[PDB]
């Protein structure tokens, strides 16, 4: 994957650099130990003379030169990856000396999908209630994330933290993959469990990642299976009531899997099980998931 050697990638300022004085910073959207994302109004960032709400990632008190380097590498990878409907897209950056490094991307009106789905439990019907979610919505979100991941894989990039908290919902039921990264407080966040000298999203991780620290596109497929469970539980937390310890990891390696969530179809639950194959090479590819979910979306209609 090209996303592990980011320091050699180009930053073309003539294309991406956006003047600080055209960016009006607003309220924080998320804050971690070293990073934060701020809502902003950017004047003319993507369309001449047009104000646009954007999301700006930058560092905060506690960050060091190390995090500054990391954020520059993030900027470089976003440029390399390029645009897709189902990934949050880069709009510009402020990199000039005298102010903080700022990475400016599309703002997504409804925010993270897990929180959103959990807000709609009382506003769901399998089939049609104007603003209700339906099975069609849930399969559609699943299909979109698969399309985004197929795209990322095509760019030789791996996500490493795929989960509903890293999927954002925009207008018109469009969902976008993101990575909040440093803007998430992984100490306070119960989704990230202490494992040695790191805080890791253990409930989303493939066995080979947990045990061998191996990250590949096919470990992303495992995480995609967990995301499917999150979608079809309407934003529930994975492995309900289970202590995430050494016994959890062993049983997982042994072949223990989550039961079907409340809103799933049989085919969608089988798709989760397929993503959770013990053998990485035997999991579906994102291209295959795109095909399959597209078929399920049609079967739903
Ligand atoms: N391409 C790519 C990938 C990649 C790698 C690394 C970083 C990113 C990335 O997402 N960067 C990034 C993220 C950011 O976080 C965002 C982006 C949009 C956004 N919209 C929000 N909406 C709300 O909160 C509404 C309820 C009120 S919050 C919000 N936060 C900001 C800046 C980034 F560069 C991304 Cl997309 C591999 C997936």
Task: Give residue 92 CA to ligand 1 midpoint distance, Å.
Answer: 13
**Whole-number Å distance between alpha carbons of 257 and 122:** 28
* Together in a domain, 195 and 206: yes
Angstrom distances, CA of residue 19 to CA of 45, 70, 125, 285:
9, 22, 47, 41
Angstrom distances, CA of residue 145 to CA of 6, 75, 167, 290:
24, 22, 8, 9
Q: What CA dihedral angle connects 198, 201, 204 and 209, to 10 degrees?
A: -10
Which segments of the chain does DSSP mark as H helices, in order?
13-16, 65-81, 113-119, 135-154, 207-212, 217-231, 246-254, 266-275, 286-300
Pocket lining: 157 vs ligand 1, CB cutoff 6 Å? yes
**Which CATH number covers residue 67?**
3.30.200.20
Mutate to test the pocket of ligand 1, among 3, 88, 108, 162 (most ligand atoms within 8 A of CB): 88
Pocket lining: 165 vs ligand 1, CB cutoff 6 Å? no
Question: Whose C-alpha lies nearest to ligand 1, atom 13?
Answer: 180
Count of domains in the chain?
A: 2
Coil vs helix vs strand at 53: strand
* Together in a domain, 150 and 271: yes
> Which residue segment(s) compose the domain that 91 sits in?
1-107
Name all contacts of 61-68 with Cβ < 8 Å and 24+ positions apart. 62/33, 62/34, 63/34, 63/35, 63/182, 64/34, 67/34, 67/35, 67/182, 68/101
Structure tokens at 144: 């979109």
Mutate to test the pocket of ligand 1, among 32, 39, 90, 179 (most ligand atoms within 8 A of CB): 179
* Together in a domain, 150 and 59: no
Which domain-ending residue is among 60, 78, 107?
A: 107
* Together in a domain, 86 and 157: no
* Together in a domain, 139 and 72: no
* Together in a domain, 77 and 207: no
* Residues that are catalytic: 161
* Together in a domain, 259 and 144: yes
Resolution in A: 1.6
* Together in a domain, 187 and 79: no
Method: X-ray
**Whole-number Å distance between alpha carbons of 88 and 145:** 12
Burial grade of 225 (CB within 10 A; 0-12, 13-18, 19 or more): buried
């Amino acid at each position: 994957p090209l996303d592990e050697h980011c320091e050699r990638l180009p930053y073309d300022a003539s294309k991406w650099e956006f003047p600080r004085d055209r960016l009006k910073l607003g309220k924080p959207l998320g804050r971690g130990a070293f990073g934060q994302v701020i809502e902003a109004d950017a004047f003319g960032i993507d369309k001449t003379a047009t104000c646009r709400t954007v999301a700006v990632k930058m560092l905060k008190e506690g960050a060091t030169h190390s995090e500054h380097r990391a954020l520059m590498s993030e900027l470089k990878i976003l440029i390399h990856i390029g645009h897709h409907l189902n990934v949050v897209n880069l709009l510009g950056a402020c990199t000039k000396p005298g102010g903080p490094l700022m990475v400016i991307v599309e703002f997504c009106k409804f925010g993270n999908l897990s929180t959103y789905l959990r807000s709609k439990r009382n506003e769901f019907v399998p089939y049609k209630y104007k603003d209700f979610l339906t099975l069609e919505h849930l399969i559609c979100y699943s299909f979109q994330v698969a399309k985004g991941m197929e795209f990322l894989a095509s760019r030789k990039c791996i996500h490493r933290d795929l989960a509903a908290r890293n999927i954002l919902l925009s207008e018109k039921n469009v969902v976008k993959i993101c990575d909040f990264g440093l803007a998430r407080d992984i100490y306070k966040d119960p989704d990230y469990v202490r494992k040695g000298d790191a805080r890791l999203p253990l409930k989303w991780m493939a066995p080979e990642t947990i045990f061998d620290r191996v990250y590949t596109i096919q470990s992303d497929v495992w995480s995609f299976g967990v995301l499917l469970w999150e979608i079809f539980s309407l934003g529930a937390s994975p492995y309900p009531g289970v202590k995430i310890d050494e016994e959890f990891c062993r049983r997982l390696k042994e072949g223990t899997r989550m039961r079907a969530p409340d809103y799933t179809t049989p085919e969608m639950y089988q798709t989760m099980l397929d993503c959770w194959h013990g053998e990485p090479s035997q999991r579906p590819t994102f291209s295959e998931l795109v095909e399959h979910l597209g078929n399920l979306l049609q079967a739903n209609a």
